[PDB]
From a paper:
The MS-ring is a transmembrane ring assembly of a single protein, [name], and has a two-tier ring structure; the S-ring is an upper ring located in the periplasm, and the M-ring is a lower ring embedded in the inner membrane. [name] is a 60-kDa protein with a large periplasmic region between two transmembrane helices. The MS-ring provides a base for the assembly of the flagellar structure. Previous sequence analysis revealed that the periplasmic region of [name] has three ring-building motifs (RBMs), namely, RBM1, RBM2, and RBM3, which are conserved in SctJ/SctD, SctJ/SctD/SpoIIIAH, and SpoIIIAG, respectively.
Therefore, we prepared [name] fragments from a thermophilic bacterium, [name], and determined the crystal structure of a fragment consisting of residues 58 to 213 (Aa-FliF58–213) at 2.3-Å resolution. The crystal belongs to the space group of H3 and contains two essentially identical molecules in an asymmetric unit (the root mean square deviation for Cα atoms is 0.694). The structure of Aa-FliF58–213 consists of two distinct domains corresponding to RBM1 (D1; Pro58 to Ser122) and RBM2 (D2; Arg123 to Asp213). The D1 domain (FliFD1) is a compact globular domain composed of two α-helices (α1 and α2) and five β-strands (β1 to β5). β1, β2, and β3 form a core β sheet flanked by the two α-helices and another β-sheet made up of β4 and β5. The D2 domain (FliFD2) is more elongated and consists of two α-helices (α3 and α4) and four β-strands (β6 to β8 and βi). An intramolecular disulfide bridge is formed between C147 and C182 at a pole of FliFD2 but is not essential for the [name] function, as discussed later. Aa-FliF58–213 forms a dimer related by a pseudo-2-fold symmetry in the crystal, and β4 and β5 form an intersubunit β sheet with βi of the dimer mate. However, the dimer is a crystal-packing artifact because [name] forms a ring structure, and the 2-fold symmetrical dimer cannot be fitted in the cryoEM density, as shown later. We found that FliFD1 shows structural similarity to both PrgKD1 and PrgHD2, although the N-terminal α-helix of FliFD1 (α1) is longer than the corresponding helix of PrgHD2. FliFD2 resembles both PrgKD2 and PrgHD3, which adopt a common RBM fold.
Author numbering:
A (entry chain A), B (entry chain B): 58 to 213
Write the structure that this text describes.
Amino acid sequence: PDDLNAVVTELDKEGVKYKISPDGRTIYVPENVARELRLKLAAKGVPRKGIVGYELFDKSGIVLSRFQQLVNFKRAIEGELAKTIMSLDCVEFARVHIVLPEKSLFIREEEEAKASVFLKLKPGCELTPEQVKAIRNLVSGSVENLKPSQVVVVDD
Amino acid sequence: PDDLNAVVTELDKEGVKYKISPDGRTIYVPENVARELRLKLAAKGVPRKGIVGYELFDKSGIVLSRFQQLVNFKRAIEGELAKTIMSLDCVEFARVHIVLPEKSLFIREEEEAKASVFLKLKPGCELTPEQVKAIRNLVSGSVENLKPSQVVVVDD
């Protein structure tokens, strides 16, 4: 019962079909509701941004909204990249976040993207500059508007 | 494209509110009114490539909607995969399309996805069984919930 009280009590008033995951950190709300909650919660609670928007609700599951599908696909791409990075002996855990351009200038043909890689390394192990460079090229190789020099790798 | 003239007349009826770029394929429309739009002209209308949803507009550029950003990312991912497949040059042109899972049951994290690979080959060359398998592995390697067997490869 952590932090869920703030939203569920203000959503209990309207009376729309919502329910909490068996865990207790993932909520399921309509897409029109999730669109109002994603930006506000991202500034508030950060965990995996576990807010799922649906198009149709059922007791067994949900029909994902189109937006939620695209969100899930992005994180799936990032999860796969992180999985490859974790194949490194020194790397125990890895997380990849690709930053998408929010604007599009008519003066430019292409908008540049950014990317951050967070690594939990093995206590005694340490990455070489060539291995880090391999990481930058791996992530940037996924899309055309992302270059290795815009991929930042940090040890958290 | 003459298809654009069939969608600028569709909006000329609906709400009369749009923005045509100096480029002949790109059409700018607010996200809130592009939300109901793409659901309509889905069948025999547009591959929704030209339609771009924004939050704000001026003569120097636009603020991309979060939805549009995710849409562009998916196409960029597919475009990059297609670019790699086209590096064979036996394949003159390639189009990659990943179909996202529509449902999320409460007893399972994520369902399985599928993908279609549209290939345009040169009249002489023909794909080898090893190459086809490599194509399926390349596309399926993008996300965890996509298997090589669920990737169909066709020859346009």
